[PDB]
Structure formats: C-alpha cells, structure tokens
C-alpha cells in the first residue's frame, strides 16, 4: 500500500509510533542539549539557507526543528509527523502564533501529500548505531519533494567502527549465562540451555559509553551522502575493514559511533556521538565477539561488517573478522533492534 507499509511489519510500526507519541519520549530527545543545541546552531548560523525558503521537517515530533527553521526566517515549513504527537505539535504552532508559517501534516512521509516542492529538508532520524529505526530511509524517501539543488540538513552521515578490548564486559556475558549451568536449580538441571543463553546475550549490542583507551586501532569510516543516496542503498550495508592494530591485546569486538554534518552556505556544523565528544542520548554501541581474537600491535584485523535491513525497522548485523598474521577468525550475528542498555 505504501513504501513504508511494504518494508515494515505492522506490529513493529504500532509500537514504534506509540513510543514517539509520548510527550516524555519527545522530551527525552529535546533534553539532549548536545543534540538539540547543535541542530539550532546549524540552522541559525546558516540562516541564508532558510530565510524565505520552503522547508520540510520529516518526523517533526513536538515541532522543535520546525520552530528553529522559523527562528531562521523560513516562509513556509511543512512539518510531517506520523505519531499522535502531531496533535501536540499543532497546539504549539498555534500557541506560538505561527499558523501562517508552519503547517503540520499528520501521517507518514511516505503516505502524505505536500502542496509544493521545498528548498531544504530537515530531520533528526538517526537511531542508535545510526541505522536503527530505518528512518534514514524515510528521510531519503522525502527527497521526492526536494527541488533540484535543494539541500538536506543533515547533509551527510559517517559511521565509525573500531576494535576494542574490554575483558570485564566480555566476562559479564558468561556470568549472566552461567545461571543456566546449574544441575539442581530447585532440583532441575538447567545446563542444556546454557549454550542458548550465551548466544542470546552475545546477540545484543551494548549501548553505553566507554574510555577511549579501550580502542585498539584507528577507526574506519563509512559514509552516507544524503543528497545522493537512494533508499535501496540502505537495505544492505557492507562495511569492509582492515585495521592496523596500534595496541596488543584480546579484541573483544567492534565499537561504533556516528557523526552527521550540516553543510550549509555559511558553514558546516558537526553533530558527533564519538567517545571523544560530550555524551549524547545515543551513547556508543559495542558488538561483542563470542570468540575474541588475539592481536599484537602491528597486526592487521580484517573483515566485514554486514548490516541487512529487516522488517522490524532495524538490521541483522553480521560481523566476520580475522587476524591476518595468524588466521584466527571470529563470526558474530547481532540483532540491532534488541540492545542491552548498560549505561547508568
């Protein structure tokens, strides 16, 4: 029926939009000062990309990004929102006396109608590990409304990946799973499910931050150029890597973060979720290897991170890595939709 409904199980959609229908959940994003403040700076400091222009806000939520477009002088902003947060945005448009400049359009950006083409698309559709939620595809989809030579804010996104060593985090998985390695849990031998429990815990990406000293090699970068990319380009994401190891140790997995850039007429502003930068509500993401790899400084850790889109608005992640000097190899499968939120 729509591009959205074809790639998305209803069960997932329903829960996804319920989440965003909570004022508490919109509030959580708004309160990330790094996020919200950087969006405001990027828009305001590139005021010429907005002054008297026509704007589309893809997934406007409370409307906050659309108000920043108004602050920068846009003539007309179409704010599209699929969740019931749409009504709340409409209330704020009226109470801020902007009915003539911001028009809220309830529904999916894949399904609504705009009355005209726009000069610039604004959105915040980055999930944890960048790709989660598959809203990047809705943002790309929206370019059907973009005038030729229209801009996108953000303009590009970069994923970073780097090998890490973290013995304590790795060990925490077997600790959890060894609950099942009891021969008499209230008289019951649970041992047969221990292997399954381990696989379950290792399939969860870990969302939290960490000291940069755990990183063992300089990151590789994979880039999406939102001006040029097609939706289809995000269904299968292949990220080859060849890490030149800077430190010797046990590699326990790969760490991920992401930056986006707003490339405007006056300047480029970056929003970074890197472990060197102040913390955001995205944290960072780590994918463990169930069999870790010994590598010495100067070795090469080669392989591929393959992200395959699924119908639950996320990705199946396949990471395969080897140390070239020894041939020792590790394969791992993760479910991006089911992360472990380890931060306190």
């Amino acid at each position: 029926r729509s591009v959205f409904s074809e790639r998305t199980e209803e069960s997932s959609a329903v829960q996804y939009f319920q989440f965003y229908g909570y004022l508490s959940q919109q509030q959580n994003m708004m309160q990330d000062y790094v996020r919200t403040g950087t969006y405001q700076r990027a828009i305001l400091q590139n005021h010429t990309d907005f002054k008297d222009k026509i704007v589309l806000d893809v997934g406007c939520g409370s409307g906050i990004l659309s108000f920043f477009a108004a602050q920068a002088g846009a003539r007309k902003i179409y704010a599209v929102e699929a969740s019931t947060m749409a009504q709340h945005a409409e209330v704020l448009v009226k109470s801020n006396n902007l009915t003539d400049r911001i028009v809220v359009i309830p529904g999916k950006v894949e399904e609504v109608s705009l009355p005209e083409q726009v000069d610039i698309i604004i959105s915040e559709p980055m999930g944890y590990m960048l790709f989660n939620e598959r809203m990047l595809e809705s943002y790309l989809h929206a370019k059907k409304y973009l005038k030729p030579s229209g801009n996108m804010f953000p303009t590009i996104g970069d994923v970073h990946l780097a090998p890490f060593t973290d013995e304590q985090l790795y060990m925490e998985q077997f600790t959890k799973a060894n609950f099942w390695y009891q021969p008499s849990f209230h008289g019951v031998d649970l041992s047969a499910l221990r292997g399954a429990a381990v696989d379950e815990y290792f399939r969860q990406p870990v969302v939290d931050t960490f000291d940069i000293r755990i990183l063992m090699a300089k990151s590789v970068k994979y880039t999406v150029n939102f001006l040029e990319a097609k939706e289809g380009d995000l269904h299968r994401i292949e990220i080859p890597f060849k890490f030149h190891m800077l430190h010797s140790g046990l590699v326990h997995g790969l760490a991920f973060w992401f930056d986006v850039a707003f490339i405007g007429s006056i300047m480029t502003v970056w929003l970074s979720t890197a472990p060197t930068e102040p913390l955001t509500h995205w944290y960072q993401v780590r994918c463990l290897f169930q069999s870790p790899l010994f590598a010495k400084a100067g070795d090469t850790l080669s392989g591929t991170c393959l992200l395959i889109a699924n119908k639950r608005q996320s990705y199946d992640i396949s990471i395969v890595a080897q140390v070239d000097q020894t041939g020792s190899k590790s394969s791992n499968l993760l479910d991006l939709k089911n992360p472990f939120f380890r931060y306190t």
């Binding site: 829960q15 996804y16 989440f19 965003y20 959940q25 959580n28 994003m29 309160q31 990330d32 999930g127 944890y128 989660n132 939620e133 969302v207 913390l279 955001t280 509500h281 995205w282 944290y283 992360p339 939120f341 931060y343």
Partner: peptide
C-alpha cells in the same frame, strides 16, 4: 521496546 536511550543526566 526501547527505541531511544535515556538522555545522560547532569
């Protein structure tokens, strides 16, 4: 069913 993690606290 957590889509977005909680913003880090002051």
């Amino acid at each position: 069913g957590a889509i977005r993690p909680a913003a880090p606290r002051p």
